[PDB]
Amino acid sequence: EDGFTAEHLAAEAMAADMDPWLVFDARTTPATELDAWLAKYPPSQVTRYGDPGSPNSEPVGWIAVYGQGYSPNSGDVQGLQAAWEALQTSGRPITPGTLRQLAITHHVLSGKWLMHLAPGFKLDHAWAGIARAVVEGRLQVAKVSPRAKEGGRQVICVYTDDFTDRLGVLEADSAIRAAGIKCLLTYKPDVYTYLGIYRANRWHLCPTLYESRFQGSRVLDRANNVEL
């Protein structure tokens, strides 16, 4: 019964993020309370490790805001990973087109707009507006990463549920832009993330579907090379 030993059970229960998260749950907390929460927990003050001087004395993996109607839904992540590894043995060609296929089959359709900023006002102000858009129902979920010990750059993630829905992608872009964010957004679908389609790529696939630059907002399909 090796699976029950200390050695094994130690390795078995590891995750990359084992930390508490700072959360505003709109489904559960009145919208009117957001501003005291935003004020108490800004991402430029809240540290990854709960350093002296932070609002938090415990390490924090993420700061998150959940809108009403937020529910977990993955499709069939198991089937997907099975199907994905079946293609490596296939010899078959692997394109952004083939991953799109996989995700449609397995109902793993969600994804995120990512953007990064350096700690300080612009990060706090952008976060605040994005949080506010979650709580109103214009966005479903957003997270922002807490502050690293040394300078660093922090990310904001804005989730949408279906990446093949051009219009839901753009509405999330519109919402981010209406909060006054001027920087580059890049849209990474959860499939890429689940199938480990990271930056330095084995299959040399681009880990980014869309990008959005403030010119206005021009949204480029990095798959078909076409302005949405």
Side-chain angles (χ1 to χ4, degrees):
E1 295 159 318
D2 49 61
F4 292 104
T5 60
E7 295 69 11
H8 183 285
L9 276 184
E12 197 49 16
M14 299 279 284
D17 181 7
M18 312 196 83
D19 286 319
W21 289 3
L22 268 165
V23 180
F24 191 93
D25 200 344
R27 295 167 311 170
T28 269
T29 309
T32 68
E33 277 169 313
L34 181 69
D35 298 82
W37 186 83
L38 298 174
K40 188 166 190 220
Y41 298 123
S44 42
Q45 277 166 55
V46 162
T47 52
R48 184 62 189 88
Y49 294 105
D51 302 309
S54 313
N56 64 290
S57 61
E58 298 281 340
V60 159
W62 283 105
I63 296 152
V65 178
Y66 297 128
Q68 309 192 39
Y70 168 68
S71 52
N73 190 46
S74 307
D76 187 357
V77 173
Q78 170 177 39
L80 186 91
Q81 267 139 351
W84 171 240
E85 72 137 1
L87 295 205
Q88 275 85 112
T89 338
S90 284
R92 288 260 66 204
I94 304 154
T95 61
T98 53
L99 304 187
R100 191 190 171 88
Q101 279 161 321
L102 288 163
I104 290 161
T105 317
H106 293 109
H107 289 48
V108 177
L109 291 166
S110 55
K112 49 212 157 302
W113 280 110
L114 315 172
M115 87 217 53
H116 66 133
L117 291 93
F121 189 86
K122 289 187 188 213
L123 179 62
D124 293 354
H125 184 264
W127 174 236
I130 283 160
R132 200 166 308 105
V134 170
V135 176
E136 299 177 8
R138 288 183 284 108
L139 288 169
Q140 43 185 43
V141 188
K143 297 170 171 149
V144 56
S145 82
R147 178 171 189 147
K149 293 182 182 289
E150 71 319 305
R153 274 228 146 175
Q154 292 159 247
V155 282
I156 299 179
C157 323
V158 174
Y159 294 90
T160 63
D161 47 39
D162 186 339
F163 78 83
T164 67
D165 175 3
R166 80 178 231 99
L167 171 67
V169 174
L170 301 173
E171 283 173 323
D173 173 87
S174 300
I176 297 168
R177 302 304 188 195
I181 287 91
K182 287 169 192 179
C183 43
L184 167 78
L185 322 178
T186 42
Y187 188 106
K188 192 180 181 84
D190 291 339
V191 56
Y192 288 59
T193 292
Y194 281 126
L195 303 178
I197 305 312
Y198 301 154
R199 57 214 159 268
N201 203 242
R202 156 162 273 98
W203 307 264
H204 288 65
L205 294 179
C206 188
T208 287
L209 243 172
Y210 319 98
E211 63 176 60
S212 178
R213 320 187 157 260
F214 207 50
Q215 301 289 256
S217 194
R218 265 192 70 269
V219 181
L220 219 8
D221 196 323
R222 201 156 168 73
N224 310 289
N225 207 300
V226 191
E227 172 178 313
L228 296 176

